[PDB]
Scaffold this active site. Structure first.
Site, PDB file in Angstrom:
ATOM      1  N   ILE A  12       0.863  -1.176   0.000  1.00 16.34           N
ATOM      2  CA  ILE A  12       0.000   0.000   0.000  1.00 16.34           C
ATOM      3  C   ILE A  12       0.901   1.228   0.000  1.00 16.34           C
ATOM      4  O   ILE A  12       0.695   2.144  -0.802  1.00 16.34           O
ATOM      5  CB  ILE A  12      -0.953   0.013   1.235  1.00 16.34           C
ATOM      6  CG1 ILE A  12      -1.883  -1.218   1.234  1.00 16.34           C
ATOM      7  CG2 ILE A  12      -1.772   1.327   1.286  1.00 16.34           C
ATOM      8  CD1 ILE A  12      -2.762  -1.363   2.482  1.00 16.34           C
ATOM      9  N   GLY A  13       1.844   1.287   0.954  1.00 18.03           N
ATOM     10  CA  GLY A  13       2.729   2.437   1.068  1.00 18.03           C
ATOM     11  C   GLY A  13       3.874   2.221   2.041  1.00 18.03           C
ATOM     12  O   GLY A  13       4.067   1.125   2.570  1.00 18.03           O
ATOM     13  N   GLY A  15       6.866   4.776   4.699  1.00 18.98           N
ATOM     14  CA  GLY A  15       7.232   6.061   5.290  1.00 18.98           C
ATOM     15  C   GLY A  15       8.296   5.842   6.361  1.00 18.98           C
ATOM     16  O   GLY A  15       8.805   4.727   6.493  1.00 18.98           O
ATOM     17  N   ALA A  16       8.617   6.882   7.142  1.00 21.38           N
ATOM     18  CA  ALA A  16       9.624   6.765   8.207  1.00 21.38           C
ATOM     19  C   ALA A  16       9.210   5.697   9.252  1.00 21.38           C
ATOM     20  O   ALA A  16      10.055   4.943   9.724  1.00 21.38           O
ATOM     21  CB  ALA A  16       9.846   8.115   8.875  1.00 21.38           C
ATOM     22  N   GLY A  18       7.780   2.849   8.759  1.00 22.44           N
ATOM     23  CA  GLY A  18       8.033   1.500   8.247  1.00 22.44           C
ATOM     24  C   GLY A  18       7.223   1.279   6.959  1.00 22.44           C
ATOM     25  O   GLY A  18       7.179   2.172   6.116  1.00 22.44           O
ATOM     26  N   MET A  19       6.581   0.117   6.819  1.00 26.30           N
ATOM     27  CA  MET A  19       5.811  -0.250   5.629  1.00 26.30           C
ATOM     28  C   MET A  19       4.434  -0.759   6.023  1.00 26.30           C
ATOM     29  O   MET A  19       4.334  -1.494   6.996  1.00 26.30           O
ATOM     30  CB  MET A  19       6.560  -1.359   4.868  1.00 26.30           C
ATOM     31  CG  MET A  19       5.826  -1.850   3.633  1.00 26.30           C
ATOM     32  SD  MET A  19       6.887  -2.815   2.538  1.00 26.30           S
ATOM     33  CE  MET A  19       6.981  -4.313   3.428  1.00 26.30           C
ATOM     34  N   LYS A  30       0.876  -2.934   9.405  1.00 25.66           N
ATOM     35  CA  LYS A  30       2.087  -2.121   9.305  1.00 25.66           C
ATOM     36  C   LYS A  30       3.188  -2.713  10.168  1.00 25.66           C
ATOM     37  O   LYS A  30       2.929  -3.105  11.299  1.00 25.66           O
ATOM     38  CB  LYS A  30       1.842  -0.662   9.673  1.00 25.66           C
ATOM     39  CG  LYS A  30       1.309  -0.438  11.074  1.00 25.66           C
ATOM     40  CD  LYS A  30       0.857   0.983  11.253  1.00 25.66           C
ATOM     41  CE  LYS A  30       0.173   1.143  12.574  1.00 25.66           C
ATOM     42  NZ  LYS A  30      -0.537   2.441  12.652  1.00 25.66           N
ATOM     43  N   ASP A 125      -1.056  16.128  14.875  1.00 26.52           N
ATOM     44  CA  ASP A 125      -0.529  15.982  13.520  1.00 26.52           C
ATOM     45  C   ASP A 125      -1.637  15.725  12.533  1.00 26.52           C
ATOM     46  O   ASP A 125      -1.496  14.913  11.613  1.00 26.52           O
ATOM     47  CB  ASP A 125       0.578  14.931  13.454  1.00 26.52           C
ATOM     48  CG  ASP A 125       1.534  15.106  12.300  1.00 26.52           C
ATOM     49  OD1 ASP A 125       1.512  16.191  11.658  1.00 26.52           O
ATOM     50  OD2 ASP A 125       2.260  14.147  11.994  1.00 26.52           O
TER      51      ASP A 125
HETATM   52  C1  LIG Z   1      -1.098   7.595   8.082  1.00 24.10           C
HETATM   53  S1  LIG Z   1       0.205   6.362   7.972  1.00 24.10           S
HETATM   54  C2  LIG Z   1       0.054   5.171   9.375  1.00 24.10           C
HETATM   55  C3  LIG Z   1      -1.293   4.444   9.342  1.00 24.10           C
HETATM   56  O1  LIG Z   1      -1.922   4.250  10.372  1.00 24.10           O
HETATM   57  N1  LIG Z   1      -1.667   3.990   8.128  1.00 24.10           N
HETATM   58  C4  LIG Z   1      -2.806   3.210   7.831  1.00 24.10           C
HETATM   59  C5  LIG Z   1      -3.492   2.503   8.821  1.00 24.10           C
HETATM   60  C6  LIG Z   1      -4.604   1.742   8.502  1.00 24.10           C
HETATM   61  C7  LIG Z   1      -5.032   1.707   7.183  1.00 24.10           C
HETATM   62  N2  LIG Z   1      -6.082   1.090   6.588  1.00 24.10           N
HETATM   63  N3  LIG Z   1      -6.131   1.354   5.256  1.00 24.10           N
HETATM   64  C8  LIG Z   1      -5.123   2.162   4.935  1.00 24.10           C
HETATM   65  C9  LIG Z   1      -4.891   2.692   3.562  1.00 24.10           C
HETATM   66  C10 LIG Z   1      -4.336   3.955   3.371  1.00 24.10           C
HETATM   67  C11 LIG Z   1      -4.146   4.464   2.096  1.00 24.10           C
HETATM   68  C12 LIG Z   1      -4.523   3.692   1.024  1.00 24.10           C
HETATM   69  F1  LIG Z   1      -4.330   4.184  -0.233  1.00 24.10           F
HETATM   70  C13 LIG Z   1      -5.084   2.447   1.162  1.00 24.10           C
HETATM   71  C14 LIG Z   1      -5.262   1.944   2.441  1.00 24.10           C
HETATM   72  C15 LIG Z   1      -4.364   2.418   6.168  1.00 24.10           C
HETATM   73  C16 LIG Z   1      -3.234   3.160   6.504  1.00 24.10           C
HETATM   74  C17 LIG Z   1       1.237   4.194   9.261  1.00 24.10           C
HETATM   75  C18 LIG Z   1       2.102   4.559  10.443  1.00 24.10           C
HETATM   76  N4  LIG Z   1       1.122   4.995  11.468  1.00 24.10           N
HETATM   77  C19 LIG Z   1       1.680   5.636  12.702  1.00 24.10           C
HETATM   78  C20 LIG Z   1       2.310   4.592  13.618  1.00 24.10           C
HETATM   79  O2  LIG Z   1       2.117   3.408  13.348  1.00 24.10           O
HETATM   80  N5  LIG Z   1       3.136   4.966  14.616  1.00 24.10           N
HETATM   81  C21 LIG Z   1       4.023   4.018  15.280  1.00 24.10           C
HETATM   82  C22 LIG Z   1       5.394   4.136  14.674  1.00 24.10           C
HETATM   83  N6  LIG Z   1       5.904   5.517  14.749  1.00 24.10           N
HETATM   84  C23 LIG Z   1       7.274   5.632  14.349  1.00 24.10           C
HETATM   85  C24 LIG Z   1       8.183   4.596  14.614  1.00 24.10           C
HETATM   86  C25 LIG Z   1       9.430   4.575  14.019  1.00 24.10           C
HETATM   87  C26 LIG Z   1       9.862   5.621  13.206  1.00 24.10           C
HETATM   88  C27 LIG Z   1      11.183   5.559  12.514  1.00 24.10           C
HETATM   89  N7  LIG Z   1      11.808   4.369  12.500  1.00 24.10           N
HETATM   90  C28 LIG Z   1      12.906   4.292  11.731  1.00 24.10           C
HETATM   91  C29 LIG Z   1      13.397   5.352  11.004  1.00 24.10           C
HETATM   92  C30 LIG Z   1      12.685   6.524  11.101  1.00 24.10           C
HETATM   93  N8  LIG Z   1      11.577   6.656  11.846  1.00 24.10           N
HETATM   94  C31 LIG Z   1       9.005   6.707  13.037  1.00 24.10           C
HETATM   95  C32 LIG Z   1       7.725   6.707  13.571  1.00 24.10           C
HETATM   96  C33 LIG Z   1       4.938   6.549  14.323  1.00 24.10           C
HETATM   97  C34 LIG Z   1       3.581   6.317  14.955  1.00 24.10           C
HETATM   98  C35 LIG Z   1       0.227   5.953  10.682  1.00 24.10           C
END
Ligand SMILES: CS[C@@]1(C(=O)Nc2ccc3[nH]nc(-c4ccc(F)cc4)c3c2)CCN(CC(=O)N2CCN(c3ccc(-c4ncccn4)cc3)CC2)C1
Length: 328
Positions: A12-13, A15-16, A18-19, A30, A125
């Site tokens: 799907i995608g 970012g920082a 992960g995947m 994720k 955010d």
């Molecule tokens: C908005 S993106 C997200 C998310 O919840 N995505 C998501 C969650 C559930 C979902 N259901 N369907 C889709 C989706 C989205 C778009 C699409 F076109 C189709 C389906 C979908 C997408 C993925 C990550 N999550 C936040 C999130 O998971 N967290 C925990 C991790 N955290 C973090 C940890 C490490 C790092 C790092 N590590 C190494 C190097 C640099 N940095 C940085 C940050 C941040 C907070 C937010």
């Protein structure tokens, strides 16, 4: 490597963080690998702790969490959530939204935010990529990695203090005197999202830190004497008094095809002074959302809801917080 009950993975995608993949339980999964840095551990623990305590239609939940059976073997954590179809950031790259889609999406963002704010939590955010959507136009707020418990008594900071949350959605006070520990921080970001839905362009696209404030003052115009009196910092006051007078750019010139009630609410969410900025409950009651407004169907949290903990202690806390999902 994606080692997860869950089969037939599809990208799907990334970012920082992960995947993120889709997988058959069809869910979102994720992979997070944060244990080498304290900041990554803090963000992971906030995300998990918060999402597991919240239960709301307009907030993404956590369905399952996968990790090793011991702290020594835990290197990654997989978070399972409901699969959605896209996000508002992606939708706005290809579609111009009608007013009735904007109205309904805004209603849902504010309905979810009411619940978050009722738990004494700040998202910090809010932006289009953190708003997940499906074909039935259900909207869910995601990414609580920078979330905090509100603390208005300790919101004060100096002029031009560094900030982590996404630049284009920062309230002006972030650059002048605020650490982003009050609920008004999130209302500003919601105002920015509404403006962006109205024109498919970010309203305040700052190229760097102080340029963000330049863009905000460029549209709102010079702050009033009363709003300058609420500014606590000597340096913030001196800076604002040093600027040439700038008149407000009217909302109907920036958004000539927008609904007048949408622009009145926009004006109230994008109020310079955070003490005068509309609150989430007042925004839900605004005439623009009158067709959807129903306090009885806008639930609140049952009860209200790291900086100096080493990464090792944060790993133990993440391990404990995910224990409930292990077999037996
Ligand atoms: C908005 S993106 C997200 C998310 O919840 N995505 C998501 C969650 C559930 C979902 N259901 N369907 C889709 C989706 C989205 C778009 C699409 F076109 C189709 C389906 C979908 C997408 C993925 C990550 N999550 C936040 C999130 O998971 N967290 C925990 C991790 N955290 C973090 C940890 C490490 C790092 C790092 N590590 C190494 C190097 C640099 N940095 C940085 C940050 C941040 C907070 C937010």
């Amino acid at each position: 490597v994606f080692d997860v009950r869950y089969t037939n993975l599809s990208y799907i995608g990334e970012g920082a963080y992960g995947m993120v993949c889709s997988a058959y339980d069809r869910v979102a999964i994720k992979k997070i690998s944060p244990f080498e840095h304290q900041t990554y551990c803090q963000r992971t623990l906030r995300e998990i702790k918060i999402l597991l305590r919240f239960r709301h239609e307009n907030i993404i939940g956590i369905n399952d969490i996968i990790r090793a059976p011991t702290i020594e073997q835990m290197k990654d954590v997989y978070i399972v959530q409901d699969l959605m179809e896209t996000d508002l950031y992606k939708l706005l790259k290809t579609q111009h939204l009608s007013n009735d889609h904007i109205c309904y999406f805004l209603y849902q963002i504010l309905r979810g935010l009411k619940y978050i704010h009722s738990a004494n939590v700040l998202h910090r955010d809010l932006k289009p990529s953190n708003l997940l959507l499906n074909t039935t136009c259900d909207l869910k707020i995601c990414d609580f990695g920078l979330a905090r418990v509100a603390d208005p008594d300790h919101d004060h900071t100096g002029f031009l203090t560094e900030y982590v949350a996404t630049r284009w959605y920062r309230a002006p006070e972030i650059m002048l005197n605020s650490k982003g520990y009050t609920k008004s921080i999130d209302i500003w970001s919601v105002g920015c999202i509404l403006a962006e839905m109205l024109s498919n362009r970010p309203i305040f696209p700052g190229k760097h830190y102080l340029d963000q404030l330049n863009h905000i003052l460029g549209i709102l115009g010079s702050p009033s004497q009363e709003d300058l009196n609420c500014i606590i910092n000597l340096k913030a006051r001196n800076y604002l008094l040093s600027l040439p007078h700038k008149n407000k750019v009217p909302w109907n010139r920036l958004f000539p095809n927008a609904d007048s009630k949408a622009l009145d609410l926009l004006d109230k969410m994008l109020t310079f002074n955070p003490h005068k900025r509309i609150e989430v409950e007042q925004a839900l009651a605004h005439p623009y959302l009158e067709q959807y407004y129903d306090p009885s169907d806008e639930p609140i949290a049952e009860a209200p809801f790291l900086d100096d903990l080493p990464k090792e202690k944060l790993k133990e806390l993440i391990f404990e917080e995910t224990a409930r999902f292990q077999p037996g």
